[PDB]
């Protein structure tokens, strides 16, 4: 019942101090909505941080288009900038607006990672959906773009979803989300964070079922278990058949609205949550790290899974089941299909990524 500012959450996760993503660019893919910038300047000023430069990029005709909807479209865009910008104010923000279609989504991503002028080193994605609700073509194309981004030295972060292990499908089975299920994507799960003064009192799996949402996570049907996830104790799917797949998510962060983020949407202060708040949070972390290293970390997943356990805060309590019946999936020691490796400890992650 205590709400945080991004700075509070960042201190709890121990983000590298004295860094603000200066000289880095963060791309945000938006499939609808827009941001009113006076509401941004108002937000950054009340936080005591310099307002980061934010530029709009039109994809396939789409534009920065807010109109003051009570909830919905505007909530998506303003959120990412406010959360990531409060933590990486030195970073440049390129927001790519595209039509809400797979063509629009693909084009915004291909445009971003090939942007000659803006040159994003980080790409944050929120829009998700069940992997099997994607056509086989769109999956292949979108997965190719991510592989393209990895070879380009670009980090891509995606939310895992806010509908538990079932993922919003009622067929009676479990479904992970896409693009989160892609192995070329840093998948971000959700947790409930209790922190009081730069330290984590307790952190558990986010699960406000059977109504108010839960972190996505599980085992992919489409994508096989990657080589870097072999020593991760990833279980076979809970669905009948139960063969190995890609484990979702990779990381997790504060996503519970009850312990949510204090933001300003459409001129008015409020508190929000969800895994779509996590991807910008960790995008700022990556930006900060890129500043120190002097080069983009790029594709991170293989490296993350071979780092010492002390680099992360292992979440071991809670489950993904929104119904709380079968309790699938369950968090535990090490990697789990609710929170992945857990929440990152910024300074330790930075230390582990520095040259020997």
What residues are annotated to the active site? 76, 80, 276
Among the residue ranges 58-66, 112-120, 175-183, 203-211, the one whose residues contact a second copy (CB under 8 A): 203-211
DSSP class of residue 52? P
**Closest approach of Cβ 86 to a second copy, in Å?**
23
Closest CA to 189 of 17, 8, 340: 340
- The residue from 41, 53, 133, 210 that contacts a second copy (CB under 8 A) is 210
Q: Which is nearer to a second copy, 11 or 111 (CB)?
A: 11
- Residue 251: strand pairing partners: 188
Answer whether 215's CB lies under 8 Å from 320's CB. Answer: yes
Q: Are strands 200-205 and 186-195 parallel, antiparallel or unpaired?
A: antiparallel
Give the position of tokens 């019942």: 1
Answer whether 281's CB lies under 8 Å from 191's CB. Answer: no
Tokens of 62: 């789409």
Report residue 324 CA to chain centroid gap. Answer: 24
Type and span of the H or E element at 94: strand 92-97
Secondary structure (3-state) at 156: strand
Number of residues assigned to the chain:
356
Asked if 204 touches a second copy (CB under 8 A), the answer is yes
Within residues 269-328, the interface with a second copy by CB under 8 A covers 316-319, 324-325, 327
Tokens of 126: 């929120």
User: Taking CB under 8 A as the rule, which mask of x and - marks residues 245-274 in contact with a second copy?
Assistant: -------------x----------------
Q: Which is nearer to Zn ion, 99 or 129 (CB)?
A: 129
State the SS3 of 201-255. Answer: EEEEECECCCCCCECCCEECCCCCCCHHHHHHCCCCCCCCCCCCCCEECCEEEEC
Distance CA 326, CA 320 (A): 10
Q: Which is nearer to Zn ion, 98 or 315 (CB)?
A: 315
Tokens of 102: 């797979």
- The interface partner of residue 256, options being Zn ion, a second copy, none and the CB cut-off 5 to 8 Å by kind, is Zn ion
Q: Which is nearer to Zn ion, 39 or 330 (CB)?
A: 330
- The interface partner of residue 324, options being Zn ion, a second copy, none and the CB cut-off 5 to 8 Å by kind, is a second copy
Within residues 73-132, the interface with a second copy by CB under 8 A covers none
Asked if 216 touches a second copy (CB under 8 A), the answer is no
- The residue from 256, 282, 319, 330 that contacts Zn ion (CB under 5 A) is 256
- The interface partner of residue 50, options being a second copy, Zn ion, none and the CB cut-off 5 to 8 Å by kind, is none
- The residue from 201, 227, 242, 309 that contacts a second copy (CB under 8 A) is 201
Asked if 197 touches a second copy (CB under 8 A), the answer is yes
Within residues 164-223, the interface with Zn ion by CB under 5 A covers 169, 171, 208
DSSP class of residue 310? G
Q: Which is nearer to a second copy, 53 or 327 (CB)?
A: 327
Type and span of the H or E element at 158: strand 155-159
- The interface partner of residue 318, options being a second copy, Zn ion, none and the CB cut-off 5 to 8 Å by kind, is a second copy
Asked if 71 touches a second copy (CB under 8 A), the answer is no
Q: Which is nearer to Zn ion, 80 or 314 (CB)?
A: 314
**Closest approach of Cβ 29 to a second copy, in Å?**
33
Tokens of 168: 């919003």
DSSP class of residue 193? E
Would you tell me which residues interact with a second copy (CB under 8 A)? 1, 196-197, 199, 201-205, 207, 209-210, 258, 316-319, 324-325, 327, 333
């Amino acid at each position: 019942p205590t709400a945080y500012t991004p700075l509070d959450v960042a201190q709890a996760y121990q983000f590298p101090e004295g860094l603000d993503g200066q000289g880095q660019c963060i791309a945000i893919i938006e499939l609808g909505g827009g941001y009113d910038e006076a509401s941004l300047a108002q937000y950054f000023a009340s936080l005591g941080v310099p307002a980061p430069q934010v530029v709009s990029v039109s994809v396939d005709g789409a534009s920065n288009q807010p109109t003051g909807d009570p909830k919905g479209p505007d909530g998506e865009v303003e959120l990412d900038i406010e959360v990531a910008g409060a933590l990486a104010p030195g970073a440049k923000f390129a927001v790519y607006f595209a039509p809400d279609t797979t063509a629009g989504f693909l084009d915004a991503i291909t445009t971003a990672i090939h942007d000659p002028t803006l040159k994003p080193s980080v790409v944050s994605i929120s829009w998700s959906g069940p992997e099997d609700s994607w056509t086989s073509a769109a999956i292949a194309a979108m997965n190719r773009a991510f592989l393209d981004a990895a070879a380009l030295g670009v980090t891509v972060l995606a939310a895992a979803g806010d509908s538990g292990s079932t993922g919003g499908e009622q067929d009676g089975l479990y479904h992970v989300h896409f693009p989160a299920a892609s192995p070329y994507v840093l998948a971000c799960g959700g947790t409930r964070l209790v922190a009081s003064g730069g330290r984590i009192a307790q952190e558990t799996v986010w699960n406000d079922g059977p109504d108010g949402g839960a972190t996505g996570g599980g085992v992919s049907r489409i994508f096989p278990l990657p080589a870097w996830q072999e020593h991760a104790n990833v279980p076979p799917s809970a669905n009948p058949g139960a063969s190995s797949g890609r484990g979702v998510p990779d990381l997790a962060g504060n996503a519970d609205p009850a312990t949510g983020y204090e933001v300003v949407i459409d001129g008015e202060a409020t508190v929000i949550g969800g895994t779509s708040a996590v991807a910008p949070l960790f995008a700022a972390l990556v930006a900060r790290i890129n500043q120190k290293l002097g080069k983009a970390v790029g594709y991170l997943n293989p490296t993350l899974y071979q780092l010492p356990a002390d680099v992360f805060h292992d979440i071991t309590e809670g489950n993904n089941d929104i119904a709380n019946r079968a309790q699938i999936y369950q968090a535990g020691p090490g990697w789990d299909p609710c929170t992945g490796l857990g929440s990152p400890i910024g300074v330790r992650l930075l230390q582990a990524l520095l040259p020997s």
